[PDB]
Amino acid sequence: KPDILWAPHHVDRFVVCDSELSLYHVELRLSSAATLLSINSDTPYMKCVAWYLNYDPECLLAVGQANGRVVLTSLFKDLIGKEFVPKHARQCNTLAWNPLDSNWLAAGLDKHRADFSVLIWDICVTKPLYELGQNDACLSLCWLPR
Amino acid sequence: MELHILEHRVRVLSVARPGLWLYTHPLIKLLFLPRRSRCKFFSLTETPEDYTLMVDEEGFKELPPSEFLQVAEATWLVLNVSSHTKIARSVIAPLAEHHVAVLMLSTYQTDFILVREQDLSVVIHTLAQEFDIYREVGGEPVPVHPIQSPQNRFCVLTLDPETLPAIATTLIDVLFYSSSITFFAFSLIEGYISIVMDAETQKKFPSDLLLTSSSGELWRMVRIGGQPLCGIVAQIAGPLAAADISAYYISTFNFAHALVPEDGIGSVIEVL
Amino acid sequence: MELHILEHRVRVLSVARPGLWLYTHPLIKLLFLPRRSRCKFFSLTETPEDYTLMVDEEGFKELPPSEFLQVAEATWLVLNVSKIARSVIAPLAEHHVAVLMLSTYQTDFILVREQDLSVVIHTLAQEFDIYREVGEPVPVTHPIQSPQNRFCVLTLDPETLPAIATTLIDVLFYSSSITFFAFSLIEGYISIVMDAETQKKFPSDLLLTSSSGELWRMVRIGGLGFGIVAQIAGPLAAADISAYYISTFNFAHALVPEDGIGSVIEVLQR
Structure with missing residues (x-):
């Protein structure tokens, strides 16, 4: 299912998530028209997209692939192409960057025998900083703003 | 700490090896065309002696009786242990102590315990x-x-159901057109696919579609038991729970299986 | 100009519609697994009366006899010309010789009894x-x-055949308005004849056909012919209109473009 996600900043830019990523600029005819600025197709089978809440670097999409690998595609050059991988591969349902700390990337995964589902990564392959929820499937994630 | 008795009325079948071709059509319908079948619990296990099928009553009607089919007399209920870990020392062993036959079916998602309705x-x-x-x-839990x-x-292994048609031909070729043992376990339960096949067979399928362990970890087997449809499992699950070893059990009609990690294969062998 | 008699020795079979389930295994083996079968000539027609199979000697050994299978006597050779209604079919019909045309997307095939x-x-x-x-x-x-x-x-690249295998299996084994479906695989060439409504079930980028739509209409004749194809071939040869000739165990078919359906209907009526 295609998704539209407004960037946290750059009020004239948005990304229309589809089979291939595409970042437009509000200037097709949106109303106003949209001018494509970038297109990323190196992360196939994407099932979860979340903006990087910190300003630098801008346009950093945490593309949650269907195999559980979270690719921090750039639609601080260290946080580019990062390939956070779960202990056991399975679908990545929901992703949610914490607003208080924009470098944690909470990832929600499908079921497994003895692997944690809701992995709280560390943006800083890697290992989860916090692994909460076992033998279940975190369908949605939402950090409490307070 | 909470055990659920699922709403599946499972009949355990045993398709003989020469008689697979007669059952290819309903087996294909169950395996690859979920929209064409009302079944919600399927489990096929390839063994050298015969093929073992664990399909519920709704899917049982699609299997035509034949001289090459052996069906378990009783109806098996599916017991699932939730988390709200180690079921060998808490389910299989206590049931063995009370002399109750079980047919374990562990999947990549969760482990299922099958017990007779009687x-x-x-x-x-x-x-x-x-x-x-x-x-x-x-559709809702009810205390007993x-x-x-x-x-x-x-x-x-596991597969995205939207990706299953892509590798359907290879799966059909492996299942129907094919010291060392031949073992292939397929289970499509509630939309979850769990495949247990040899590492040699893994080369046939694409690496991108198969999604397990992120490191290529391989399991080892310890088949056991004998005589068709419990001991077959208590005789191994009990000792392994006593040794406190996590295992991936796949019971069949006449024989029992317990997948263990390659590192702990020697320890599992020594325990028995 | 040249009539090449192909090496294939085709045996024509008939499968009852209720009996398709028993033959799903060898049929799938022949349809989707070239490496698991030595068959080089395979055809399969889904007519409402029954299922028609045209396999060679090697393929026929994989089909077990049953009460749902009717097998035509005598082996049918294959004739290929390197259009032909008034050249190969009409003169043969004038000699009272049975023919079973299997028109594919690549070339027109003519089947005659070896006797x-x-x-x-x-x-x-x-x-x-x-x-x-x-x-x-x-x-x-x-x-x-x-x-x-x-x-x-439609034709289909054999490399992309596994991609659409599930939908094809669903159509073939798990399914005016004659409900016709013909599948052939001869010498590595795939020719599929199917209704427009079933095309929407399949991806459009994988199926190859005329880049204009070019939907065609169908005509059926007959009602165990073991040469009723003469009744469509002759008059239509006199009309000089190209058409797919797909002869089944009982029926025979004549597929013409939707633009020329009126002309063929008029000429066949008289």
Whole structure:
């Protein structure tokens, strides 16, 4: 299912998530028209997209692939192409960057025998900083703003 | 700490090896065309002696009786242990102590315990002390033999259901058109796919579609038991729970299996 | 100009519709697994009356006999011309020789009984340089009904056949308005004849056909012919209109473009 996600900043830019990523600029005819600025197709089978809440670097999409690998595609050059991988591969349902700390990337995964589902990564392959929820499937994630 | 009795009425079948081709059409319907079948619990296990099928009553009607089919007399209920870990020392062993036959079916998602309908009362008696028994009625919970060690390496697997048609031809070729043992376990339960096949077979399928362990970890087997449709499992699950070893059990009609990691294969063998 | 007699020795079979389930295993093996079968000539037609199979000697050994299987006597050779309604079919019909045309997306195939090969050679010696294949050529010495179905003729890259395998299996084994479906696989070439409504079930980028839509209409004749194809071939040869000739165990078919359906209907009515 295609998704539209407004960037946290750059009020004239948005990304229309589809089979291939595409970042437009509000200037097709949106109303106003949209001018494509970038297109990323190196992360196939994407099932979860979340903006990087910190300003630098801008346009950093945490593309949650269907195999559980979270690719921090750039639609601080260290946080580019990062390939956070779960202990056991399975679908990545929901992703949610914490607003208080924009470098944690909470990832929600499908079921497994003895692997944690809701992995709280560390943006800083890697290992989860916090692994909460076992033998279940975190369908949605939402950090409490307070 | 909470045990659920699922709403599946499972009949355990045993398709003989020469008689697979007669059952290809319903097996294909169940395996690859979920929209064309009302079944919600399928489990096919390839063994050299015969093929083992664990399909519920709704899917049982699609299997035509034949001289090459052996069907278990009783109806098996599916017991699932939730988390709200180690079921060998809490489910299989206590049931063995009360002399109740079980047919374990562990999947990549969760482990299933199959017990006979006629033994449901004994199951509730045995497992009430340690587990809070729940029953899934209307979609909502309701409170109530020598061993062998084949040298081939196995790997549990899962597949995105939207990706299953892409690798359908290879799966059909492996299933129907094909020291060391031949083992292939397929289970499509509630939309979850769990495949256990040898590492040699893994080369046929694409690496991108298979999604397990992120490191290529391979499992080892310890087939056991004998004589068709419990001991077959208590004789191994009990000792392994006593040794406190996590295992991936796949019971069949006449024989029992227990996948263990490659590192702990020697320890598992020494335990038995 | 040249009538190549192909090496294939095709046996024509008939499968009852209720009996398709028993033959799903060898049929899938032949359809989707070239590496698991030595068959080089395979055809399968989904007519409402029954299922028609045209496999060679190697393929036929994989089909077990049953009460749902009717097997035509005598082996049918294959004739290919390197349009032909008034050249190969009409003169053969004038000699009272049965033919079973299987028109594919690549070339038109003519099937004749091996017991009548001499008569075929006699009839076609004065119009074609008849060749025989041994690897290299060897020079040898009823009421009408037109369903409103708009059919399409498709080919398919064998590499992309596994991609659409599940949908094809669902259509073949798990399913005016004649409900016609013909599948052939000869010498590595795939030809699929199917209704327009079934095309929407399949991806459009994987199916290859005319880049104009070019949907076709169908005509059926007959009602165990073991040469009713003469009744469509002859008059339509006099009309000089190209058409797919797909002859089944009972029916025979004549697929014409939707633009020319009126002309063929008018000429066949008289």
